[PDB]
Design a protein around this ligand. Structure first.
Ligand SMILES: *[C@@H]1O[C@H](CO)[C@@H](O[C@@H]2O[C@H](CO)[C@@H](O[C@@H]3O[C@H](CO)[C@@H](O)[C@H](O)[C@@H]3O)[C@H](O)[C@H]2NC(C)=O)[C@H](O)[C@H]1NC(C)=O
Ligand SMILES: *[C@@H]1O[C@H](CO)[C@@H](O[C@@H]2O[C@H](CO)[C@@H](O)[C@H](O)[C@H]2NC(C)=O)[C@H](O)[C@H]1NC(C)=O
Ligand SMILES: *[C@@H]1O[C@H](CO)[C@@H](O)[C@H](O)[C@H]1NC(C)=O
Ligand SMILES: *[C@@H]1O[C@H](CO)[C@@H](O)[C@H](O)[C@H]1NC(C)=O
Lengths: 354, 132, 231, 122, 115, 112
């Protein structure tokens, strides 16, 4: 229960991985036994590598485990991954049949093989990308269509003369450096999650319906793990690029039914539940700022998103960052009075612990 | 299984409770109480080594598990007063059935070193007894 | 034959159960003798006495010298260096030693007697196993009740290296033979293991007749007032 | 402190909490009430006088007090306290705190687990 | 042949078995392990030397050996053996076998009193 | 090694133990019996010869033997064993013992 780590972990074959688990730094917890075990079916929760010197037969040459007592963390490295290593695992301390653990899910996907006739582009959610398409020396006076196989329909919703979709409106252009040579290009601003898939580009047509592919991958951001305790404080560092340094930035908290709730804005908003215990700082030359929240309660734990928009709300097509927070609650911070009363003309005296 | 009342680690007993707003008769509802006892099958009676054989009898008094005797702070008028919280805590002295992960338990054994003897100290739970 | 020089760590029983902790620096393979001398980098009282030489394989000189009072620098993690010059070689030799790092602590197990020894009613045997510790120095002592037994009543083997599942570790065993009437009265016996990596330098396990091949499990749980206004 | 009777909870209007303090040799006592950690004002409850009880050898006294609260927020999970002060107590005060979850249950679940493994209680 | 200790099965790593031979007068002896019917290679276990044990009647000797096997094979119900060869045995060998049962207790009595 | 049918265990006179071998390629065995750690002389038991079993494809064999022993020490708990010698075994012998296969009794009582 006080143990925390990355909930889901993805990779491909041949690659490595690095998993970190967190624990309270009390002296029993630093000297006790640490373990990594594979919670299979049929009862047991068989250990794969441990802290005392046990390495299993399947993990020989591939893995190790290092304990850092001053962080209160311990790391597990696993090299040369396969597809039989997909399953549910556990960090832990002590004896397996107790419950001082944390569940981790690991999925390994099959890589690329013998289909490499495309030029892929990867891009962050809410950024720009280009799709180059070599124009040739006869196919100018046709249509420069661009399908996207919704099912197996050729869905032309982009043409290079303005015949566009009301879906993809307001952000698509072309710029001319062609007229005889072998390139033109289209810049796509403010990509969404909806705009993935395979693109069958063309530039004119010589009638064999000859095909060119140029596919893209749009990825949602990886949350950073923060480990704090009761009655403490946290800082986030929101470090988007200098391209949006004149936009109003914000910070929500993810809820169950896909609902950010605004904690702070740059145009002057606040929740009532954070009155008295939140700060927001002026941004630097890089357009990077920090948000401080003190007096951490139990219900503050969850996913947080910082972004940017013209109004200060989570809208689609906006660049985001992420975090995941854990409030420990087996804290060592001493309790204190929260309210101190006084009368007019009198004194007060408050005790402040470090 | 919702709210913890007692979490005792000298006897290793835990009591929770929950208002189950049941489906049928929707203007009345039950109060459930869960108790969990974990019984060690290899501990001694006193926690030293040669005491007496392994404990075979385990007794739990819920009037003692729910007891509360540490002083508290109460704001009455515009004041802070200190009060007690129980009628029966005329007095450690309780017997423990299990160990506790956050406390040392040591012993003393005399061994010989050629001439005299010593008073060598021995850790009974080695994880919790590092000097740190 | 040609000489050699080595360095030896202090013995375990003097660092745990004792006060003094003498290092030693020896010199073997010397032909006849020397008027040699040594060198120790901390020398705040370094009365490095030599004593007499010994006689070795086929005829050899072997002299040595110890350094007293080095317990707390050894436990703090310091370093010691020895270096000697003598007639019967070209250049002085050198050596160094330090307290070990990346150690492990033992897992101690005490086993009940076998089932077929209890029928013949003459003597029984108890086994003490220690496993998985990183330096190879260890001690084993037995008790009866709460009194130590004399050393000449049991048998302990040496520490050896076990097959590898990762890091290299060691193991040791011991047995003790006691009268079969004391096992049935209800006397308790205990096994003690001392190691460099344990917290208070010793740990122990205990066993008697009711704990181990029990053939009977009796347990009675009494819960007094389950419906009782818990505040 | 005594919980409300069972047949006041059906009406869902107002419920009664009784406080009984018994067996003190001087005839002086204090009784206050708290909700959560907020003291209620003195015009919200009724306190009787201190009288002497039938003699089991030596003369001791008794006193009572009641308080009526809303039936809805007793079920929501608020807590109430009766605080009694008398000059013979060591810390001069004592307190009892009651709520709905710390009461006589309807269902009881008991699970006894036997642990050959260890005796540490994590 | 001794069953594994109860403190060890709760870690799910490996369980250890212990073989002991005691009371033989000439100090030469062999120790081999098996799994079912297959003899295991020598690099899988550890035996000690053959020391002399402290009695007063006559001179006898003793030796030990350990083998650490996987917990999943101990749970599945496989059997392991210890063979010992000596001059004085009439058939030159003797064998002991063990599995996950037969260290289990004979009967258990639990009584709960709700009063 | 098979334990001793309860039909003659009810009578408490003697019991029969059966050693069975099965599945070996040449028709050559050695069967001996022991008790505790002492070997019994060869006139206390009988042993049949090696017949060929019919089974799937290849040809293997089988032997049996029978020992009778007093029920007094068997009730007390004295143990017995059967040895089998063959040249396809790596250490030339195997051995199976038996002793008075019972399961665990469990008594749980709740008192109100
Ligand atoms: C349970 O066992 C513990 C451990 O044996 C008992 O505590 C120990 O009791 C002995 C005898 O009363 C104490 O020994 C005394 O030592 C002082 C010197 O410090 C000496 O003046 C006395 O003459 C006597 O030798 C010992 O200090 C004490 N505490 C320890 C070891 O921490 C305990 O009493 C037992 N409890 C029950 C309920 O059985
Ligand atoms: C606490 O965790 C940090 C990770 O943020 C550790 O920092 C890394 O430590 C390794 C040493 O194993 C170095 O190789 C890296 O360069 C360090 N930095 C990063 C960014 O990875 C740090 O070592 C841990 N604390 C202690 C005391 O070791
Ligand atoms: C072992 O740990 C080290 C950390 O010092 C790491 O660099 C290395 O990759 C690990 N070895 C593996 C995973 O085989
Ligand atoms: C100790 O001696 C070794 C030679 O065996 C040498 O490589 C090492 O550097 C020496 N260390 C120190 C601290 O002198």
């Amino acid at each position: 229960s006080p143990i925390f780590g990355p909930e889901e972990v993805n990779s491909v074959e041949g690659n490595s991985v690095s998993i970190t688990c967190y624990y309270p730094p009390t002296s029993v917890n630093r000297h006790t036994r640490k373990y990594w075990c594979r919670q299979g079916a049929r009862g047991g929760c068989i250990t794969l590598i441990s802290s005392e010197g046990y390495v299993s037969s399947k993990y020989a040459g591939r893995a190790n485990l290092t304990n850092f007592p001053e962080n209160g963390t311990f790391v597990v490295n696993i090299a040369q991954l396969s597809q039989d290593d997909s399953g549910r695992y556990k960090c832990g301390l002590g004896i397996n049949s107790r419950g001082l653990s944390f569940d981790v899910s690991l999925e390994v996907s099959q890589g690329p093989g013998l289909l490499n006739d495309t030029k892929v582009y990867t891009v962050d959610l809410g950024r720009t990308v280009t799709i180059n398409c070599p124009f040739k020396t006869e196919n100018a006076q046709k249509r420069k269509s661009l399908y996207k196989q919704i099912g197996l329909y050729p869905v032309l919703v982009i043409d290079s003369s303005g015949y566009v979709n009301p879906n993809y409106t307001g952000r698509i252009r072309l710029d001319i450096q062609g007229t005889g040579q072998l390139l033109f290009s289209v810049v796509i601003n403010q990509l969404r999650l909806s705009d993935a898939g395979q693109y069958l580009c063309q530039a004119g047509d010589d009638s064999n319906s000859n095909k060119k592919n140029a596919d893209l991958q749009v990825l949602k951001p990886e949350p950073e793990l923060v480990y704090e305790d009761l009655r403490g404080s946290v800082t986030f560092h929101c470090a988007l690029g200098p391209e949006v340094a004149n936009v109003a930035k914000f910070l929500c908290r993810q809820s169950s039914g896909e609902n950010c709730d605004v904690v702070v804005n740059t145009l002057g908003k606040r929740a009532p539940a954070f009155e008295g215990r939140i700060l927001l700082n002026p941004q630097d030359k890089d357009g990077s700022f920090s948000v401080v929240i003190t007096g951490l309660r139990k219900e503050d734990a969850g996913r947080y998103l910082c972004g940017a928009h013209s109004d200060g709300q989570l809208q689609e097509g906006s660049p985001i960052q992420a975090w995941q927070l854990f409030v420990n609650e087996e804290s060592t911070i001493p309790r204190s009075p929260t309210v101190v009363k006084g009368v007019a003309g009198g004194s007060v005296a408050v005790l402040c612990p470090y | 299984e919702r709210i913890v009342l007692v979490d005792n680690k000298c006897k290793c007993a835990r009591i929770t409770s929950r208002i189950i707003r049941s489906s049928e008769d929707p203007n009345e509802d039950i109060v459930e109480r869960n108790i969990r006892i974990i019984v060690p099958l290899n501990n001694r009676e006193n926690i030293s080594d040669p005491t007496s054989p392994l404990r075979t009898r385990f007794v739990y008094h819920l009037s003692d598990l729910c007891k509360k005797c540490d002083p508290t702070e109460v704001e009455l008028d515009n004041q802070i007063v200190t009060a007690t919280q129980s009628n029966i805590c005329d007095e450690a002295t309780e017997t423990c059935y299990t160990y506790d992960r956050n406390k040392c338990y040591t012993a003393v054994v005399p061994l010989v070193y050629g001439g005299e003897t010593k008073m060598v100290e021995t850790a009974l739970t080695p994880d919790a007894c590092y000097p740190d | 034959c040609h000489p050699r020089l080595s360095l030896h760590r202090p013995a375990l029983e003097d660092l745990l159960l004792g006060s003094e902790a003498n290092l030693t620096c020896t010199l073997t393979g010397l032909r006849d003798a020397s008027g040699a001398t040594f060198t120790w980098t901390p020398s705040s009282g370094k009365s490095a006495v030599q004593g007499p030489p010994e006689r070795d394989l086929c005829g050899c000189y072997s002299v040595s010298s110890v350094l007293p009072g080095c317990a707390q620098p050894w436990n703090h993690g310091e370093t010691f260096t020895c270096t000697a010059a003598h007639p019967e070689l070209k250049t002085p030799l050198t050596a160094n030693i330090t307290k070990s790092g990346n150690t492990f602590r033992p897992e101690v197990h005490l086993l009940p007697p076998p089932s077929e020894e209890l029928a013949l009613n003459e003597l029984v045997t108890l086994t003490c196993l220690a496993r998985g510790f990183s330096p190879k120095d260890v001690l084993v002592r037995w008790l009866q009740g709460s009194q130590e037994l004399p050393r000449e009543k049991y048998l302990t083997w040496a520490s050896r290296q076990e097959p590898s599942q990762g890091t290299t570790t060691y193991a040791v065993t011991s047995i003790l033979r006691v009268a079969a009437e004391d096992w049935k009265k209800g006397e308790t016996f205990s096994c003690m293991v001392g190691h460099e990596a344990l917290p208070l330098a010793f740990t122990q396990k205990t066993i008697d007749r009711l704990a181990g091949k029990p053939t009977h499990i009796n347990v009675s749980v009494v819960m007094a007032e389950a419906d009782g206004t818990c505040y």
